[PDB]
Amino acid sequence: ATAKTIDLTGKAVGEVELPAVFDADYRPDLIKKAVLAAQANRLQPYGPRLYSGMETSARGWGSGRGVSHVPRLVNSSRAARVPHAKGGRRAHPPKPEADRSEKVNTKERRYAIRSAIAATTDPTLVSLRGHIFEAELPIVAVNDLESLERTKQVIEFLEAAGLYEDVLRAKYGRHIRAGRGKLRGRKYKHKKSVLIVAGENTPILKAARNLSGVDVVTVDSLNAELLAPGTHAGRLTVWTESAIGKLEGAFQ
Amino acid sequence: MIAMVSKQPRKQRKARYAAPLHIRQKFMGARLSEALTKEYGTRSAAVITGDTVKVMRGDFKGTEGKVQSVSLMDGTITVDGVISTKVDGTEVPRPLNPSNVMITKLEMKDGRRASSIKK
Amino acid sequence: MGKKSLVKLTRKTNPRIVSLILTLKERANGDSAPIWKDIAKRLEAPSRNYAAVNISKINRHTAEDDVLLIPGKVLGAGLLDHPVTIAALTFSDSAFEKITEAGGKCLSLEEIMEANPKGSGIRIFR
Amino acid sequence: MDTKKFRGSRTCGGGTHKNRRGAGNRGGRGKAGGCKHHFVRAMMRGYSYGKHGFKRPDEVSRDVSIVNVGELDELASYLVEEGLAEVKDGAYHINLENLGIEKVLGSGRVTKNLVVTSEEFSASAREKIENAGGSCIDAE
RNA sequence: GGUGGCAAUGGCUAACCUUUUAUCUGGGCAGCCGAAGCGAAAGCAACAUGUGCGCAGCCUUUUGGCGAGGCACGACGUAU
RNA sequence: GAGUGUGACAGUCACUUAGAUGUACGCCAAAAGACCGGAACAUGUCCCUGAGUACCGUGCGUUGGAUAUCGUGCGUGAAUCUGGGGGGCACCAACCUCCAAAACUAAAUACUCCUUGAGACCGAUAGCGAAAUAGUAGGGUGACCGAACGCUGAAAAGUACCCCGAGAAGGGAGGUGCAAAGUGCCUGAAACCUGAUAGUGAUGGAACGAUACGGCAUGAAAGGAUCUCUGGCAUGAAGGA
RNA sequence: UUAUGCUAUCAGGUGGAUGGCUCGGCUCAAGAGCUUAUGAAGGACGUGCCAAGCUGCGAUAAGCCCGGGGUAGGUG
């Protein structure tokens, strides 16, 4: 219903009545749908070239030679063009014309977003989802958090709020992943720690940007994958006064 | 130089491998000592044949010597005293990476060296 | 609750529905009230066949101060002349407005269970 | 199909491997054979041979949007509160032109004084509106 | 089909704009489906329940009653 | 705190990165000037306003274009503001609408040799045929068809000297190196081949095994310690001398 | 010491799978988009101290001249 507001030193200096977006029931299925839809819409087309394994003029020898009826090169016995021939085409490969985009209705997507926002208030979900913190949820900060311009200032605020331990666990649990992702450019497996939500584009977006595991966004740029990384709700989030004021009819 | 335009390992390694010679010059950079960095305003400079550096990583940490040679294609330097004794028994020099050493004395016989190191 | 009932429950994805089914079976146990187990089986049934009851059916078949249990959603087609209390799984916005203006109560299955655990006098509408 | 479940089944649910070859295993391509061997299937799916009737040009043929007097009566108050209708000393003044309907039909009940202007009315709608105390107005 | 959002005061948007580099957020009612059918067409245009049985559920004197949904009629629109 | 290199995992070692700087020739480009000039109405026995064109007959193609698409072969063939065309068969009438048979015209759009970026893409029989001395070697008179082949090590420190050997082969011995990883060198499976070890074996019967019981060998780790062996005692279902 | 053999394991050879690595490939997006008689693209031949292929170059022949950035190495 109501939440205390903490100054940059971390002390409650007032009250704010939480909007109706915060008393929304918990819908893990819809959160899963929203996150999967966002990932699919982010996904990228791929596939082999048009005639890969197929630019040969190979034809079969027929019967009467003691060999399989597969197409062969016109001037050698090397088989070609068939999916079970060496150098042959992939049978049923990925198509660049394949459509991986998912549609979720706007109403149920906003319902899922509201569910995730309300899940950001429950201490049990947030701690079950892996975060380390000692504050009392939800954490609403006075607007002067948005005006601080340096990572050191963000560190001071997080330490005063008892949130820097989750940034530290994210930093020291960042780890090089196993497999081909390293070669493809996904060398590390990163953790998610803290979601700062600001009223509008302010210096805090840039000041908190480099924090390990931290995402800093505005209410306009708030979505299901930010509020529930990996389809798991219970994200540790710092709301600002402007953000709480602007969340009045954000998804209703 | 490789910008955050491309964060892909393939493009980074391609850029390094096909770097031109004027870019491989910058690959010879090494950390300056505390006095040198204070009195130059930059934290690093390119190792040159002749100046004294201290090796701070590898089998030869702590050795100070003059750069005998520099290979830009290999990205290696040859320092007085950093040698491998071969099966003959003769001493061949062991090439080092400039990022494993620290400049303690600069060679300033070239008037262009100051702006070369900075600006 | 055997393997069939557990298959249906595991099939359901809404945690509210799952908790409702579990608590309904618990109350059918403790209170000795088959109303809750019947509602639980109706909710275990496929979601494509949930009740979608318009206001017109309620108005047609209800009287003053009638206590209604709708295993599903209440929709807002029609008029409701008399006030009637309706415990449903969900309500349309227009259904909520119509019931409130007519003077009935728009409560949930949990609320109706807490209001009267024996289920006496409640009548089920599909 | 579920390829994973059929990994190891050989025939993959097709029966004999001689099934699942080409259009011969479907009896031809598309909805072919509707006169000879897919005659009963064409009967079932509506692809039976024949023509019927004639088409009038779209430029002269028109369908009319409709609304029943029951619908008008039992959402007349919504119409007035939303602005598409007004109450003139007890009579709901409804104009169908701004609603998008050109014919009022007579299904349902009329329980209130309802002055409805439209391009056309059914006869039962006429009598129901006039017995309810309202009136019917023609669009000139 | 299973699971969901919304729901006759219905549902969803398409292209497109908003990207601050393909996500995303907010827009976008054109359109489609539903909302009335029958008839080739002209055209005309229906039950907000009149009756019965009855499952679950509830009540009950444990035999009956009420009985959503369901079933069977009756009535009505249109074509012949 | 994108990433890559650096003797093993790097925000602080290096290049970078965030963010700022600079940049010749060019490209766009505002203020401010020079220049041809633009827009209404009145009057009307006045003048002009696109020809083998529009239309039509017939044949053919094409089209959803149906007597109602467009094209063009042949034939035929107008009118001039009191005019001409269209309004899905023709004609008549009313109404509505336009002015062809001459011409130009940015933008929104298509594509990918090329540049940059990205990727639930492939990872050396895959992914382009080509990780390339690859359209190469090679094949076909020709049109044309078309491969295989990536990797020592942190650093060559790429094995001194000695013995054997015809040897600038090779082997032995001896070194280097954390490790031979000893140059088509990381790892180094199986098939196949050589040898050793266990069992068996020149009187023996074949889907090469399953089950039970024995001989021989092994049974360090990862398996058991009221576990294994051998007995006693109590209770013991069906059954039952 | 029972040979020729058979079965299992082990050591070695052959071979190049597996694993790991990868300056390559593929697809998508955003840019940019003509050139040649002032002789283009493409090809032949030549061109390196020891140089055969590729690549670059053209008898001035893995190259020559001028201006800027870069600065201590370079000789694909």
Swiss-Prot record, chain A:
An example molecular function term from Gene Ontology annotations: RNA binding
Hydrolase keyword on record: no
PANTHER family: 60S RIBOSOMAL PROTEIN L4
Stored Gene3D superfamilies: 3.40.1370.10
Biased composition, class Basic residues, residue ranges: 81-93
Gene (UniProt): rpl4
GO cellular component terms given for this protein: cytosolic large ribosomal subunit
Protein name listed in UniProt: Large ribosomal subunit protein uL4
GO biological process: translation
Region described as Disordered: spans on this chain: 77-106
Assembly mode: Part of the 50S ribosomal subunit.
Pfam families: Ribosomal_L4
Keywords per UniProt: Ribonucleoprotein, Ribosomal protein, RNA-binding, rRNA-binding
Ranges in coiled-coil conformation: none
UniProt keyword annotation of Nucleotide-binding present: no
Domain of life: Archaea
InterPro entries in UniProt: Ribosomal_uL4, Ribosomal_uL4_dom_sf, Ribosomal_uL4_euk/arc_CS, Ribosomal_uL4_euk/arch, Ribosomall_uL4-arc
Protein family per UniProt: Belongs to the universal ribosomal protein uL4 family.
From Swiss-Prot, chain B:
A family per Pfam: KOW
Gene Ontology MF terms: RNA binding; rRNA binding; structural constituent of ribosome
InterPro entries: KOW (IPR005824), Rib_uL2_dom2 (IPR014722), Ribosomal_uL24_CS (IPR005825), Ribosomal_uL24_euk/arc (IPR005756), Ribosomal_uL24_KOW (IPR041988), Translation_prot_SH3-like_sf (IPR008991)
One Gene Ontology CC term in the entry: cytosolic large ribosomal subunit
GO process terms (BP): cytoplasmic translation; ribosomal large subunit biogenesis
Membrane-crossing segments per the record: none
Keywords: Ribonucleoprotein, Ribosomal protein, RNA-binding, rRNA-binding
CDD domains with a match to the protein in the record: KOW_RPL26
Subunit text: Part of the 50S ribosomal subunit.
Family, as annotated: Belongs to the universal ribosomal protein uL24 family.
Function: One of two assembly initiator proteins, it binds directly to the 5'-end of the 23S rRNA, where it nucleates assembly of the 50S subunit.
Protein name: Large ribosomal subunit protein uL24
Source organism: Methanosarcina acetivorans (strain ATCC 35395 / DSM 2834 / JCM 12185 / C2A)
Swiss-Prot record, chain C:
InterPro entries reported for this sequence: Ribosomal_eL18, Ribosomal_eL18/eL18-A/B/_CS, Ribosomal_eL18_arc, Ribosomal_uL15/eL18, Ribosomal_uL15/eL18_sf, Ribosomal_uL15_CS
One of the Pfam families matching this protein, by short name: Ribosomal_L18
Transmembrane segments: none
Keywords, ordered alphabetically: Ribonucleoprotein, Ribosomal protein
GO biological process: translation
PROSITE patterns given in the database record: RIBOSOMAL_L18E
GO cellular component: cytosolic large ribosomal subunit
One MF annotation (Gene Ontology) recorded for this entry: RNA binding
Family: Belongs to the eukaryotic ribosomal protein eL18 family.
NCBIfam families xrefs: PRK04005.1 (NF003079)
Protein name: Large ribosomal subunit protein eL18
Species name: Methanosarcina acetivorans (strain ATCC 35395 / DSM 2834 / JCM 12185 / C2A)
UniProtKB/Swiss-Prot annotation, chain D:
Keyword rRNA-binding applies: yes
One of the record's GO molecular function terms: rRNA binding
Cellular component per GO, a single term: cytosolic large ribosomal subunit
Superkingdom, taxonomy of origin: Archaea
Region (Disordered): 1-32
Listed PROSITE patterns: RIBOSOMAL_L15 (PS00475)
GO annotation (BP), single: translation
Keywords: Ribonucleoprotein, Ribosomal protein, RNA-binding, rRNA-binding
Pfam family name, one: Ribosomal_L27A
Keyword Ribosomal protein among UniProt keywords: yes
Similarity annotation: Belongs to the universal ribosomal protein uL15 family.
Description of how the protein assembles with itself and partners: Part of the 50S ribosomal subunit.
Function: Binds to the 23S rRNA.
Protein's name according to its UniProt entry: Large ribosomal subunit protein uL15
Annotated source species: Methanosarcina acetivorans (strain ATCC 35395 / DSM 2834 / JCM 12185 / C2A)
